[PDB]
Every structure is written in structure tokens, then in C-alpha cells.
Design brief:
By secondary structure, the chain is of the alpha+beta class. Helices cover about 30% and strands about 20% of the residues. The structure holds ligand AEZ, calcium ion and chloride ion (5 copies). One chloride ion (CL) binds next to loops. One of its GO terms (molecular function) is beta-glucosidase activity.
Length: about 750
């Protein structure tokens, strides 16, 4: 109890069954890993490990770009306790479940005997069990730290244990970490355990004894599958350390457990014999005597040196952390040791960055829960961050997935919303990613592909058009762009605009100092806008939508001028004028001013209806109230470009959207539904109209807030938090979807868009 857990921590009971869980609302197959989830461990680009609220290591994102949900049962903390003057102690795995293998271990950690807490990047378990006299807690984390691109990359996790004797008898206590040697868990085509072997490192520095297990393979190949895992522990005063190098994971486990269940002391048996077919594992234990009212603290850690990521198109790359530890895959212990000797400083750095928000008492706790915990996705979103192609440079390219069902890196129409944490907290990455986009503006690929929607054929990448994405983990990230094919992004009317807007946002949100960034991207920017002007068929100064989904709402058709694409256009034209003034490009300034003036008038005349802006000029659903109708004006605010539309009209539109899209949709308890009829019935023109998009809502909430509709902002955002985290929601913690319908069922779990919540902190 007496450990420093913040009140805004999301919490749930260990072993809790959740009764209202959502499921996918589409016909085609889609990922549904259940609600047994937790906050990820692991750095940016290191690959991540999802340890759930029940205690299992179950959501593996170690193969970069893939999601594999499966509990590796030998991966556990276990405990032994014995009250002085009792015949027998007891031993228990801290896992609220059971396996096949390991039948001798003590499974099924009981209900109503502990809690899980999460405030990303930290999570905690507390163990308050009728049969466990000594109270235990653990704080686990990886050093995810804004404006630090070093520790933030590390494939490491720390588990700081606290143990308290409230009783009046002396108790002997042990805490054991077990890990399977997971070399060959993926990337290995034959003989998945063969050549795996475990060794014990005893590092005996003055005041810093470490005992570690290094679990690897005898091969020195340089393959995605090869590397080391390490688990270990730092000696503190009053604890003894014991270990077991090699127990069989594809066995009953009694080789390990009979010695731990006796007195909580392992055999200290080293054995480097490689295995052939049997799965193997290691065990690191502490044992201590706790006197009445005594507290002891002890840190364990877990590293993983898997230096190569491979994508399905053939390319192999080094992971970013290899810059600081090496590339040979023999460095797990160096990574473990750095963590064991520096974790206290890392806790403080995490504290130093969370404090400004946590200590602001004008903000409710639920909003802090959502803001920090939504950050999980930055590590867990199949994040790729390279330090050289294998057998190959200034930069380190970066990609974040849109999601796993739609396995696209950096989908631009989505990162327009989802990119806020990177511009605000890791701006050097954000500027790297946007240079990656600038570099593709004039790539041509005349090779043709089949459009999944209408069936027709189209060119892959047209010169002057911004790509929808920078490839797929199943193909070739950064090299082969436009992996997406359900529509043709080369005629989308939003991407070029959002591109320009993202450029100027990244200038503006990093202090308006970085002229070199504007200089590098300037030509891509002029090109993008010049190309989109060519799509103005009817000569009103605004690109026309073509009676098809030619924008991010990729089944929802727009025709003529639309509020969404049209507002983005005007804002983009305004940003360009500004960049043009900054760089002293008189003719850009003059031209983009002229186009903006004409487009502005005409947007107004075509679309303003007295109450809101019409969805578009030409659809059968033209008079629908769209949640995202003024997305250009939202970005203009963040960009400090002023009114692109009249203040009074923007206020009316927002008020209307709140009144209709939020309030008339399940009593405003679930976010902003995308499309509503002026009669107050949800628009049925497409499935996307009947969906709430979590990131459109959080962005809309931020817009509301900058415009002083503070109560409407937080009420609108609340529905998203509620659905995601709350007992009355749908069980989407650490897998926030793109969307849900009125019944609360979902589409596309683990989704980038909801990172838009950070726009609320601008
Ligand atoms: O949920 C809509 C998104 C989606 N759905 C299926 N594919 C995609 C695209 O990658 C993205 O551009 C769309 O906005
Ligand atoms: Ca037009
Ligand atoms: Cl479907
Ligand atoms: Cl003490
Ligand atoms: Cl390669
Ligand atoms: Cl509160
Ligand atoms: Cl896909």
C-alpha cells in the first residue's frame, strides 16, 4: 500500500473476469486478443513484451510488425513464504491462470488477492493474499523518456520489488524470476530449440553484485532469430541470491519447483549443455528473512538482445539500440547491468516528465489515465527504428504502424492525428519521419495494381502525390511505399494537404526556429499543393471530391466540395503562405494567398447553411453533420494561423456537433459519431458514418477546448476514456481501436489514431 502509485493509474483486480467485452463488428477476420492485456515493456524499436494484468507474458511484438498473443507459461515471478516456527512454507506462481507443461508448479493465483495498476510507462502489481503474511508489490517499467533517444530504445525492463512484514512473526521470503530461452520462438524455420544454452554471470563489483542468466544459442549467425535474453538481480543488504541455469520448459517443471517449494532456495546448478529438442529456461531467486515491520526493496530485470529485424520482403536491419550496445547479439548482460545500476535515475526521469501533468489539479484523473496510457502504442505499434541495413549513414529511419490488421507504416492520413506525441515529446523522430515523406514526393512507380474497392487497375505511385504509407512489415518498410491498395491514394484529396499541415505543425510545435526543416521540405510542399490544385475540376479554387472515397474515410464518398478536404486545403494554403514569408519566396506567398482568398469565399458560399458546414455539395448525404467537418480549422488553431473561417460559424458548428454527434448518440457517453442527419438520426449512407472514430473524437475534443467549449471538450473525450478503460466500457485497455458502433463492438484494435489525445495538451 505504502509504495508510490498515482491515483490516475488505471486499475483492475488480478484474476478479474470482465463481463462486457467488445468484439469485431466486421464480417472479414480481425484481430481480437481478448481483454487480458497490460502495459507494454520495451523501448522504441526494440520490440515489445505485453505482460498482462493476470501476470502472464502474452502479447509478443518481438518480431517487429507482427502481433502474437500467447502466454509463455514458464515466464513468471513466483514467491515462497514461511512463518518462523511453522513446519511448512508455501510457494505460488504469481499468475491468475494455468497452462500441458509445468504441472508441478503452483498455478491459479487466487481472485480478490491483488491488484494491477498502470500509468504508462510504469505498471504495478500488489499482492494481498490471506495465505501470504508478507505483503508484496512490484513496479515494472522501461525507460521511456521524452527528448531522450537513447535509453528510450533499450530492449530492457526493470521489476522493482517491495516486501513488507505487517505481522508480529519473522517470515522467510523468496522471489523467483523464471524465463524460457526463447531463441527460436520466431524467425527460425527448423529445429526451434536446437543449440540453445543458458549460462550464469556473477558480476562482483564493490557494492554492486549482480547475478544474471544469459539465455542464447551456440550459433554466431546474424539472423533475426538469434540473440540473447537475460534475467538477473541486484544484491541488496539482507538478501541472498540463488539460481538454476537450466530447467526443462517442455517438462513438468519439478526439476526447478521441488527445490524452490522446500525452502525458497534454488540449487545453484550451472549447466551450459546446449539443448536439442527440449525447451529450456533459467531461474534467478532472492531469499530474505523479514522481521516484524521490516521493509526490503530488491530490483530484478529482463533484457533482450535481438539485434536484427527482418521484414517479409527480405530486408534485414539493425535495431536502434545496437548503436549503444553493439550488433553481434551477444550483449544481453551489458543491457541488463546498465538497467540494474541506473534504474533509480530512470524512475526519477519518468517522474520528472509525468509531474507537470500529474500535479495539475485542474484536470480530472480520468484524463490523466487516458493521456499517459494511450502512449503504450508508441512502443507497441510494431515500431521500427533502424541503425543500418545488414551488411550495408547519417539518419535512423523510423516507422510506426497504423495498426496490425492494416499493417501499414506511418499511414499519413492517420498520423495527421496520431503523430502528436512524437512532435511534442520526441521531435527529432517526428522530423525524421516527415523528411522520409518529403523524399517520396516525386517518386514514380508506373507499375500497376488492383484496387480492392472497385476492382480497376492503377499506377502505384504518381509523381507529386504524397503516399498513403511507407510500406508494410510483410514487404519492404521505407523502400516500397504505398502498400495499401483498398483504394488508390494517388487521387486522394486529403493526403497532400495533411502533408503540408504536418510540416508546418512540426515547425510551429518545436518553437518556430527550425528554418533548415522548412528549407528541406519546401519543394515537396509547393509540389503537393500545385498537384492538388489540378484536381479543381469546376474552377471554384478547391479540389473536387469525385463521388468516391478519395480520402481517409475510405468507404465514405464525397463529391464536389467537402467540408473535410476543403477546410484542410484552405489551412494548408494558409500554412504555405506563412512558410513562403519565412523563406522569402515572394511568388509562393502571392500565389497561395490568391488561391486561398478565392477558395475561402467559395467554401463559405457552397457550404455554410446557417448552423453548420454541409458534408459536401453533391452527395445524397450532403446535409449530414460531420464530426470532422472543420479539421482544417482545428489544425489552423494549433498552427496559430488564425481564422480560416468566421469565429461565430465555427462556434455554431462545434455546438451543433456536440448537440447532435455526441449528445444524440447514446447520450453522449461514447464519443462523436462521424455522421448525423439534421433530424438527429445517425447517418446511414455508409458504415463509417455510423462509427465513432476514437482519434477523430479526441482531436475534436481538443478543438472544442482551444475554442473555449471546455465542458463540451472533456465530455466528448470522456466517452472515449469510458469505453476504453472503465468497468461500464468495452474492455479495450492497451488496444484502443480505430472505431466502434453504437453497440460498442469494434474495428481495428491497437490503432495509431487515438494518440490524438496529446493534441489536448498543445
Ligand atoms: O479505418 C479507416 C482507415 C483504413 N481502414 C482500412 N484501411 C485503412 C487505411 O490504411 C486508412 O487510410 C483509413 O483511414
Ligand atoms: Ca472544385
Ligand atoms: Cl465487413
Ligand atoms: Cl525496514
Ligand atoms: Cl538486407
Ligand atoms: Cl478526478
Ligand atoms: Cl495488411
Amino acid at each position: 500500500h505504502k509504495i508510490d502509485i498515482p491515483d490516475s493509474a488505471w486499475t483492475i483486480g488480478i484474476g478479474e473476469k470482465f463481463k462486457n467485452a467488445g468484439h469485431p463488428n466486421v464480417k472479414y477476420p480481425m484481430i481480437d486478443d481478448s481483454y487480458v492485456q497490460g502495459a507494454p515493456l520495451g523501448g522504441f524499436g526494440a520490440g515489445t513484451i505485453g505482460r498482462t494484468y493476470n501476470g502472464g507474458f502474452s502479447r509478443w511484438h518481438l518480431e517487429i510488425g507482427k502481433n502474437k498473443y500467447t502466454t509463455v507459461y514458464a515466464n513468471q515471478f513466483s514467491v515462497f513464504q514461511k512463518v518462523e516456527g511453522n513446519k511448512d512454507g508455501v510457494a505460488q506462481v504469481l499468475y491468475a491462470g494455468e497452462p500441458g507443461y509445468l504441472s508441478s508448479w503452483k498455478w491459479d493465483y487466487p481472485k480478490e488477492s491483488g491488484m494491477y495498476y498502470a500509468l504508462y510507462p510504469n505498471s504495478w502489481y500488489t499482492y494481498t493474499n490471506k495465505d501470504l503474511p508478507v505483503q508484496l508489490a512490484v513496479k515494472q517499467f522501461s525507460p521511456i523518456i521524452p527528448y531522450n533517444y537513447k535509453e528510450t530504445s533499450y530492449p530492457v525492463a526493470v521489476f522493482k520489488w517491495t516486501a513488507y512484514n505487517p505481522t508480529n512473526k519473522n517470515v522467510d521470503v523468496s522471489i523467483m524470476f523464471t524465463w524460457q530461452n526463447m531463441i527460436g520462438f520466431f524467425g527460425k524455420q527448423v529445429n526451434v530449440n536446437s543449440g540453445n544454452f543458458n549460462k550464469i554471470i556473477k558480476d562482483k563489483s564493490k557494492d554492486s553484485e549482480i547475478v544474471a542468466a544469459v539465455m542464447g544459442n551456440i550459433s554466431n549467425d546474424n539472423e533475426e532469430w538469434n540473440g540473447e535474453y537475460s534475467i538477473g538481480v541486484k544484491k541488496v543488504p539482507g538478501v541472498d541470491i540463488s539460481y538454476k541455469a537450466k530447467f526443462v520448459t517442455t517438462g513438468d517443471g519439478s526439476d526447478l519447483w521441488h527445490e524452490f517449494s522446500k525452502n525458497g532456495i534454488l540449487d545453484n546448478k550451472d549447466d551450459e549443455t546446449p539443448t536439442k529438442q527440449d525447451g529450456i529456461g533459467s531461474a534467478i531467486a532472492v531469499n530474505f528473512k523479514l522481521q516484524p515491520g521490516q521493509t526490503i526493496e530488491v530490483p530484478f530485470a529482463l533484457s533482450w538482445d535481438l539485434p536484427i529485424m527482418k521484414f517479409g520482403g527480405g530486408d534485414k536491419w539493425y535495431k536502434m539500440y545496437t548503436k549503444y550496445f553493439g550488433k553481434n547479439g551477444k550483449n544481453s548482460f551489458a543491457i541488463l547491468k546498465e538497467a540494474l545500476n541506473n534504474y533509480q535515475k530512470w524512475e526519477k526521469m519518468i517522474d520528472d516528465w509525468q509531474k507537470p501533468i500529474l500535479s495539475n489539479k485542474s484536470k480530472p484523473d480520468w484524463y490523466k489515465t487516458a493521456l499517459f496510457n494511450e502512449l503504450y502504442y508508441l512502443a507497441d505499434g510494431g515500431t521500427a527504428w533502424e541503425n543500418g541495413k545488414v551488411g550495408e549513414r547519417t539518419n535512423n529511419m523510423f516507422g510506426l504502424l497504423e495498426c496490425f490488421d492494416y499493417n501499414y507504416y506511418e499511414t499519413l492520413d492517420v498520423r495527421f492525428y496520431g503523430s502528436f506525441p512524437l512532435v511534442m515529446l520526441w521531435p527529432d523522430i517526428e522530423k525524421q519521419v516527415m523528411r522520409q515523406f518529403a523524399d517520396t514526393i516525386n517518386v514514380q512507380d508506373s507499375s500497376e495494381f488492383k484496387v480492392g474497392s472497385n476492382g480497376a487497375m492503377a499506377v502505384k505511385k504518381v509523381q507529386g502525390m504524397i503516399p498513403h504509407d511507407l510500406g508494410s512489415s510483410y514487404a519492404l518498410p521505407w523502400i516500397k511505399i504505398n502498400a495499401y491498395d483498398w483504394q488508390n491514394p494517388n487521387i486522394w484529396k486529403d493526403l497532400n494537404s495533411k502533408y503540408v499541415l504536418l510540416v508546418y505543425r512540426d515547425y510551429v510545435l518545436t518553437g518556430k526556429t527550425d528554418k533548415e526543416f522548412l528549407k528541406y521540405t519546401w519543394k515537396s510542399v509547393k509540389t503537393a499543393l500545385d498537384k492538388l490544385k489540378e484536381m479543381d475540376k469546376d474552377n471554384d479554387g478547391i479540389p473536387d471530391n469525385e463521388g468516391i472515397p478519395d480520402q481517409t474515410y475510405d468507404t465514405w464518398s464525397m463529391k464536389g466540395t467537402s467540408a473535410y478536404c476543403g477546410s484542410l486545403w484552405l489551412a494548408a494554403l494558409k500554412a504555405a503562405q506563412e512558410i513562403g514569408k519565412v523563406l522569402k519566396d515572394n511568388e509562393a506567398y502571392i500565389k497561395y494567398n490568391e488561391w486561398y482568398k478565392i477558395a475561402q469565399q467559395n467554401f463559405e458560399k457552397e457550404l455554410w447553411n446557417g448552423e453548420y458546414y454541409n458534408f459536401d455539395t453533391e452527395s445524397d448525404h450532403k446535409d449530414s453533420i460531420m464530426a470532422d467537418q472543420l479539421a482544417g480549422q482545428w489544425y489552423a488553431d494549433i498552427l496559430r494561423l488564425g481564422d480560416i473561417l468566421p469565429k461565430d460559424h465555427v462556434q455554431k458548428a462545434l455546438k451543433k456537433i456536440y448537440e447532435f454527434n455526441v449528445m444524440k448518440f447514446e447520450n453522449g457517453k461514447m464519443g462523436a459519431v462521424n455522421g448525423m442527419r439534421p433530424d438527429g438520426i445517425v447517418d446511414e449512407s455508409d458504415i463509417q458514418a455510423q462509427e465513432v472514430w476514437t482519434g477523430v473524437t479526441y482531436a475534436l475534443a481538443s478543438f472544442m477546448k482551444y475554442r473555449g467549449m471546455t465542458e463540451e471538450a472533456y465530455n466528448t473525450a470522456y466517452g472515449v476514456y469510458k469505453m476504453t478503460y472503465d468497468k461500464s466500457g468495452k474492455g479495450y485497455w492497451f488496444r484502443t481501436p480505430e472505431a466502434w458502433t453504437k453497440d460498442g463492438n469494434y474495428r481495428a484494435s491497437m490503432y495509431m489514431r487515438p494518440l490524438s489525445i496529446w493534441s489536448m495538451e498543445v
